[PDB]
Design an enzyme around this catalytic site. Structure first.
Site, mmCIF file in Angstrom:
data_model
loop_
_atom_site.group_PDB
_atom_site.id
_atom_site.type_symbol
_atom_site.label_atom_id
_atom_site.label_comp_id
_atom_site.label_asym_id
_atom_site.label_seq_id
_atom_site.Cartn_x
_atom_site.Cartn_y
_atom_site.Cartn_z
ATOM 1 N N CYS A 1 0.810 -1.211 0.000
ATOM 2 C CA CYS A 1 0.000 0.000 0.000
ATOM 3 C C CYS A 1 0.848 1.268 0.000
ATOM 4 O O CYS A 1 0.359 2.325 -0.417
ATOM 5 C CB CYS A 1 -0.943 0.006 1.209
ATOM 6 S SG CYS A 1 -2.344 -1.147 1.101
ATOM 7 N N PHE B 1 -10.554 -3.767 -0.129
ATOM 8 C CA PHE B 1 -9.789 -3.737 -1.368
ATOM 9 C C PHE B 1 -10.696 -3.780 -2.593
ATOM 10 O O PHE B 1 -11.767 -4.395 -2.586
ATOM 11 C CB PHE B 1 -8.794 -4.899 -1.413
ATOM 12 C CG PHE B 1 -7.775 -4.868 -0.307
ATOM 13 C CD1 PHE B 1 -7.476 -3.682 0.346
ATOM 14 C CD2 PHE B 1 -7.116 -6.022 0.082
ATOM 15 C CE1 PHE B 1 -6.542 -3.648 1.366
ATOM 16 C CE2 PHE B 1 -6.180 -5.995 1.101
ATOM 17 C CZ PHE B 1 -5.894 -4.805 1.743
ATOM 18 N N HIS C 1 -3.048 7.959 1.866
ATOM 19 C CA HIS C 1 -3.474 6.656 1.386
ATOM 20 C C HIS C 1 -4.534 6.094 2.326
ATOM 21 O O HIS C 1 -4.229 5.819 3.496
ATOM 22 C CB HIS C 1 -2.292 5.699 1.300
ATOM 23 C CG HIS C 1 -2.690 4.259 1.235
ATOM 24 N ND1 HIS C 1 -3.103 3.655 0.067
ATOM 25 C CD2 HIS C 1 -2.746 3.304 2.193
ATOM 26 C CE1 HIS C 1 -3.392 2.388 0.308
ATOM 27 N NE2 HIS C 1 -3.183 2.150 1.590
ATOM 28 N N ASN D 1 -10.223 0.562 -1.241
ATOM 29 C CA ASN D 1 -8.778 0.699 -1.082
ATOM 30 C C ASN D 1 -8.097 0.037 -2.276
ATOM 31 O O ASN D 1 -8.064 -1.194 -2.376
ATOM 32 C CB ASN D 1 -8.306 0.083 0.234
ATOM 33 C CG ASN D 1 -6.821 0.283 0.474
ATOM 34 O OD1 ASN D 1 -6.367 1.399 0.719
ATOM 35 N ND2 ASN D 1 -6.056 -0.800 0.403
#
Lengths: 381, 381
Positions: free
Chosen positions: A156, A207, A295, A328
């Site tokens: 990530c 995700f 992020h 994500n």
């Protein structure tokens, strides 16, 4: 001697792309178990549903559709061999969606693709030889002498490695123009639930597939080129006592991932020491005077860093908008936000791409626990 | 404005390390089949015995010893699942052998380990999260703010990718010193023989474990630091008519690799097109006037490029010396040769690190077919 550029690396174009099949969170807890075939997991479905309301996630894009999961029953199982069934998809599909994202950057950028000197491909879904940089060089048709950097299996936090890398390549080779492609496909990841392995399910509620690309160069030619953001600095540190917070294992069963620490608290406990190294040399303390890009590893991290620092609601708005409409997307997710912010600043009549402010921060958090902190500067209109 | 250095990137130190278990080629054609249990394959043993004397290889170093191959019977089979047996071994051992090489460069360099600003780890043996770059920062104990580039699953051509990358980092950040570690363990590769896929057998007679490291920086402080070679330029091209020449699949059986073309002829048919672009802007045509360093993918490439260009025997002497006592160590092998050359120049009273010459070429070929061509410059005494 004469190979070096003159000014700082500058993001000139931004493109984003994601798979076409959209999957909503309101329906996911049901769909997930009905494809996994996990009806018996009663409370596990109850723990997972409320986790799909942790998310603050609305839609996500999945190349893995309903049809495609019924000839792959061992991708819907928790721990069943399927590395080949997984990678066959994502060895091919990662650069394909990469091309779609890269192409919209070249278009908005507006110069010949032959003028790109370097290529930086970043992904955590699959690995192949030749790499996806070879695949995307062929799909796009760039000069066979391009200089490419393949960032394979990073995490990530790779959303800032590509800016940290693009900054050095562009500024050390005059007239060079660097294309950077971030692309993730949550096929290597997807697994079935297990009541003995709750950690594999956090990723199942966050995700989602996605690809992102930008064009980075120094000395932006006027009239033809339009600069969006300047890359001023980028440092990479590791958090003390974090060895094992984020784990990642590529097995013959796929991409195994684990959380073992309070990764939200780990960062907000340390995120002030990384801001001061960067902004103390410029005399900046008020952190609402900056534009923020973080992020979105999860809603907890955005909330715990907002409280730790007492940021206003508007600061992480673009960061929360993308996590809402995409999930994500690992490394590609950061670059999405920087696009959502310049498009937001333009529309709302801001005087500057950075929501009107001048300096800004970009944040990535992955296995390490490693933290990449890149300081950005905004440009007018 | 002031972050960038003044002079060219310069490799200042070189370190080498290899696994302790040595395996000779004179006994290998037998030993290989006799551990796999493949005595019945009569001619396959003769076709392979003719290949271990094709080699021009004498010894190679293997972390996979005699004892360890009898508790892992599925690494000795041709097509048997063993990604887990492979990665469990080499996820730990690649950075460990990396430490052995890194420390030996820091030793010759002679400055505090805290003075290393960036780290570039490159390997093709295994993949993990966190990466092997994280592992070696703890093993060596460097600043938790080190800047790392993890080059996972790159190929034989990565020997120049790390020099192409180290050049930009060091020259674009003033006073920086970059440590770059190459490390390969031929455990992901090792397989059993097969008469239906002769391609798996070339690697079984060429590949061997090894790790290499160097310290690269710009603006070398006198008195304390000693420059060995200058990195002048580095281009990356792909050969026309190469789709499929070198292939690489990381499956649940290990790293599968295939040869489908005469990669020796592929290079000698094109190696002049890369030679002139680098030296024509310096007025150099005679390619025996430079010192040579070539990645030893096999004796055929060194012989066919030696003949194609009509090179003297001494030019690739150091290139064959490393391949003689080490085999093909993939990316790490290039850096070995550059060490074998400077240690050779010192002893033989040469006036310059580059076997007495001033300009030189470094070549790396891998999946693509990709060719990395780095221009080096030598320094006196």
């Amino acid at each position: 001697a004469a190979q070096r550029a003159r000014g700082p690396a500058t993001v000139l174009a931004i493109g984003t792309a994601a798979p076409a099949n959209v999957v909503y969170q309101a329906d996911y807890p049901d769909y997930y178990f009905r494809i996994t075939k996990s009806e018996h997991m009663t409370e596990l479905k109850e723990k997972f549903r409320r986790m799909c309301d942790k998310s603050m996630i609305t839609k996500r894009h999945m190349h893995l559709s309903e049809e495609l999961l019924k000839n792959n029953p061992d991708i819907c199982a928790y721990m069943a061999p399927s590395l080949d069934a997984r990678q066959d998809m994502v060895v091919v599909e990662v650069p394909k969606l990469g091309k779609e994202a890269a192409a919209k950057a070249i278009k908005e950028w507006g110069r010949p693709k032959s003028a790109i000197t370097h290529l930086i491909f970043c992904t955590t879904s699959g690995v192949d030889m030749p790499g996806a940089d070879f695949q995307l060089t062929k799909l796009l048709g760039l000069c066979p002498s391009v200089r490419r950097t393949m960032l394979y299996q990073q995490g990530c936090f790779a959303g800032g490695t590509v800016l940290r890398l693009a900054k050095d390549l562009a500024e050390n080779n005059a007239g060079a123009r660097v294309l950077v492609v971030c692309s993730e496909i949550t096929a290597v990841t997807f697994r079935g639930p297990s009541e003995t392995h709750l950690d594999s399910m956090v990723g199942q509620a966050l995700f989602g597939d996605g690809a992102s690309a930008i064009i980075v160069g120094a000395d932006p030619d006027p009239v033809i080129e339009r600069p969006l953001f300047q890359i001023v600095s980028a440092a990479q540190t590791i958090l003390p006592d974090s060895d094992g917070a984020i784990d990642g294992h590529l097995r013959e069963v796929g991409l195994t991932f684990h959380l073992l620490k309070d990764v939200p608290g780990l960062i907000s406990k340390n995120i002030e020491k990384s801001l001061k190294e960067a902004f103390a040399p410029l005399g900046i303390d008020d952190w609402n005077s900056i534009f923020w890009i973080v992020h979105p590893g999860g809603p907890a991290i955005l909330d715990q860093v907002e409280a730790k620092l007492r940021l206003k609601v508007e600061k992480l708005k673009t960061t929360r908008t993308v996590l809402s409409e995409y999930g994500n997307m690992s490394s590609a997710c950061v670059l999405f936000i920087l696009d959502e912010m310049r498009r937001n600043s333009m529309e709302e009549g801001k005087a500057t791409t950075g929501e009107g402010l001048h300096w800004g921060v970009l944040f990535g958090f992955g296995p390490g626990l490693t933290v990449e902190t890149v300081v950005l500067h905004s440009l007018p209109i």
